[PDB]
């Protein structure tokens, strides 16, 4: 329906009418479909080498020797090339020619994204996603937020709006994950706190770029993953007036 405009002091200084994207229904299933499709589309092929365990020239010994029939080396008895021999090929390993990508049609993907955008207004789901805040959703801001070029100003705005608690939770709950993720480059396990959506490319993109667990994107790059990470809708999103005015026919 309609919301309020909050300036840099944090107080609401004007009533804004939300576009028709905001009054969409709640669809966790289509949110999950879009989220899984994007996560599959970002994937990457892997798999062993073309002849892992298979470049040997081993042949079986046949019967009459008291050993099993597995392939063995031509000049020793050591077994090779079979999936149960030591050093043998992985039976059914991953292939680099696999196609892990998924697909959602553009109409239902847009319906999923609109369902995610409507979820940002809902206080119960936004407070049900671990987001800790006292602001009154939706948090629309006047368009001065685009042109502030230092993260201290972003900190002051988030404190004024009642959203700095979730930023602190993202920063101080950012914790080391377990297992093989750390060695492969995924040391810490992160948190999602604040999502800023400016109308166009401004210095707020560089401003809140370094906020802990805070993603900032223009309305054009508003995929459903930003609106609902990990198939759960209810991201604590901060919009502006410019994003609101560039949103009347965003996904219809």
């Amino acid at each position: 329906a309609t919301a309020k405009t909050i300036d840099l002091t944090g107080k609401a200084v004007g009533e804004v009418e939300l576009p028709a994207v905001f009054d969409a229904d709640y669809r966790p299933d289509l949110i999950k479909k879009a989220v899984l499709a994007a996560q599959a589309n970002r994937l990457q092929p892997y798999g062993p080498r073309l002849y892992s365990g298979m470049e040997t020239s081993a042949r079986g010994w046949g019967s009459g020797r008291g050993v099993s029939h597995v392939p063995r080396l031509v000049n020793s008895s050591r077994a090779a090339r079979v999936p149960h021999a030591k050093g043998g090929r992985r039976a059914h390993p991953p292939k680099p020619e696999a196609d892990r990508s998924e697909k959602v049609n553009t109409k239902e993907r847009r319906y999923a994204i609109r369902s995610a955008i409507a979820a940002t207004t809902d206080p119960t789901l936004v407070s049900l996603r671990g987001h800790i805040f006292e602001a009154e959703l939706p948090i629309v801001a006047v368009n001065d937020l685009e042109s502030l070029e230092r993260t201290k100003q972003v900190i002051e705005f988030l404190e004024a709006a009642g959203l700095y608690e979730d930023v602190l939770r993202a920063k101080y709950g950012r914790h080391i994950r377990a297992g093989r993720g750390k060695l492969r480059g995924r040391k810490y396990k992160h948190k999602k706190s604040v999502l800023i959506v400016a109308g166009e490319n401004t210095p707020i993109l560089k401003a809140a770029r370094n906020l802990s667990g805070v993603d900032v994107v223009t309305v054009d790059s508003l995929n459903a993953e930003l609106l609902a990470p990990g198939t759960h809708a209810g991201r604590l999103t901060v919009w502006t007036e410019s994003a609101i005015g560039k949103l009347e026919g965003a996904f219809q």
């Binding site: 750390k182 492969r184 480059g185 040391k187």
Partner: protein, 119 residues
């Protein structure tokens, strides 16, 4: 130097461990005192054998002294008065990492040291 061009831990550790001698000169750095960084325009520099430093972490916290030895390979600096006593009883000096120490006094026996700290 290891950039955010690569963020993988294995790549960064390989670049550090196989880094050449001219990149291992920068490994010896440490936090200066407040006075030195205020009077030298940079927040830190590299520690040379001889300048007085104070170990601000470990078993020898706050022990100012003269860096007796330094190895560019292992990235280990040995401090006067920060040593170990062996079973023989002889005092073998201990190697401390250069990040553990904080410089208090410089060593201007090198005229090139001024351009080494900055520019």
């Amino acid at each position: 130097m290891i950039a955010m061009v690569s963020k993988q831990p294995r790549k960064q550790r390989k670049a550090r461990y196989a880094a050449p001698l001219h990149i291992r000169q920068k490994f010896m750095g440490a936090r200066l005192s407040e006075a030195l960084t205020k009077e030298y325009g940079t927040r830190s520099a590299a520690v040379i054998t001889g300048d007085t430093v104070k170990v601000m972490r470990g078993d020898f916290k706050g022990t100012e002294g003269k860096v007796q030895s330094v190895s560019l390979m292992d990235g280990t600096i040995t401090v006067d008065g920060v040593i170990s006593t062996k079973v023989d009883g002889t005092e073998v000096p201990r190697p401390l990492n250069p990040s553990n120490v904080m410089i208090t006094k410089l060593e201007m026996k090198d005229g090139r040291r001024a351009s080494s700290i900055k520019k």
